[PDB]
Design a protein around this ligand. Structure first.
Ligand SMILES: Cc1cccc(Nc2ccccc2)c1
Length: 120
């Protein structure tokens, strides 16, 4: 999860997390639990041009998955969101501990965002 980023979502504004909440929701469109499962995640990844396997997807979910559910719920998605836009690979020294397919934040956003980003 990285409580540093877990604080960084708390650091975010209403606006900040608002579009993310939505992208969460649009990530999990039709999801019974409303949490991003590896298929919901896979959905968006394909929405963005990736064709994952749930193995990949689970590790993506795992990065934040605190409840150990195997699903990412909002704050979970949101920590990795902020973790993404803050630093996917800006200028740190991070080792990959799993399939590292990470669509840029706004980039992934744009996948789901056209469900909220207009309509008025
Ligand atoms: C496909 C994709 C690209 C960029 C960010 C995310 N978010 C995410 C969602 C759930 C767990 C970890 C991260 C998903």
């Amino acid at each position: 999860m990285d409580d540093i980023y877990k604080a960084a979502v708390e650091q975010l504004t209403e606006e900040q997390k608002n579009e993310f909440k939505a992208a969460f929701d649009i990530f999990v469109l039709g999801a019974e639990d409303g949490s991003i499962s590896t298929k919901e995640l896979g959905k968006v990844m394909r929405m963005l041009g990736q064709n994952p396997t749930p193995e990949e997807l689970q590790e993506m979910i795992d990065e934040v998955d605190e409840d150990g559910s195997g699903t990412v719920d909002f704050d979970e998605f949101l920590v990795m969101m902020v973790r993404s836009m803050k630093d996917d690979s800006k200028g740190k020294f991070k080792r990959p501990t799993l399939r590292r397919v990470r669509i840029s934040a706004d980039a992934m956003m744009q996948a789901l965002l056209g469900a909220r980003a207009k309509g008025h």
